Amino acid sequence: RMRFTIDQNMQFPLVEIDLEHGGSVYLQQGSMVYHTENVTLNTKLNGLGKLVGAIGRSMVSGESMFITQAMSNGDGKLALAPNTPGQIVALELGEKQYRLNDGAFLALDGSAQYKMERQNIGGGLFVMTTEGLGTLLANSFGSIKKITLDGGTMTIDNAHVVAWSRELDYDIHLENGFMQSIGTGEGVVNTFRGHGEIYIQSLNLEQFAGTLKRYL
Ligand SMILES: [Ca+2]
Ligand SMILES: [Ca+2]
Secondary structure (H helix, E strand, O other): OOOEEEOOOOOOOOOEEEEOOOOOEEOOOEEEEOOOOEEEEEEEOOOOOOOOOOOHHHHHOOOOOOOOEEEEEOOOEEEEEEOOOOOOOEEOOOOOOOOEEEEEEEEEEEEEEEEEEOOOOOOOOOOEEEEEEEEEEOOOOEEEEEEEEEEEEEEHHHEEEEEEEEEOEEEEEEOHHHHHHHHHHOOEEEEEEEEEEEEEEOOHHHHHHHHHHHHH
């Protein structure tokens, strides 16, 4: 297993990861800040032509083109940074597994596995589901709040959903017509049912991007 250290004093954390010989970790594309010489970064693109094959094989394998993997030859170190201002949460995988929205993934033990699934509509919207043993690092835009469902139901703007228990029943959908959505400024929501945890974030990336539009 990889050993990590999420900075506790920094408002916007960096995560330092220690990898033993032969150890590896999946990471958010571009999240690398630095790494020791004995640590190599591998991608699926190892001009045009069969890079289409690279993308082609991932679409059926359920893999993501925006996830890379770092391998260590001996004891190595690396540091990652989330692509959005916020926090990082580490979740232990095993008896419990999780699903995550696009952009919430930061890192995953090489010992674990993951699969991507396109949601059946209200680009594309994909949800990641974990499997195996290891640690999952999720990141938020804004601050994180942990909510526990004890059998009931709850519906939340999906733009504020970071990750949630795989054991929960979920459904991402639109609450009304497109024209009605234009007025509310609300996108698809995620309705959860059952027992498990839901991690939400206090900021909406789409809404923030919207405030920048006028100046762009
Ligand atoms: Ca980087
Ligand atoms: Ca973040």
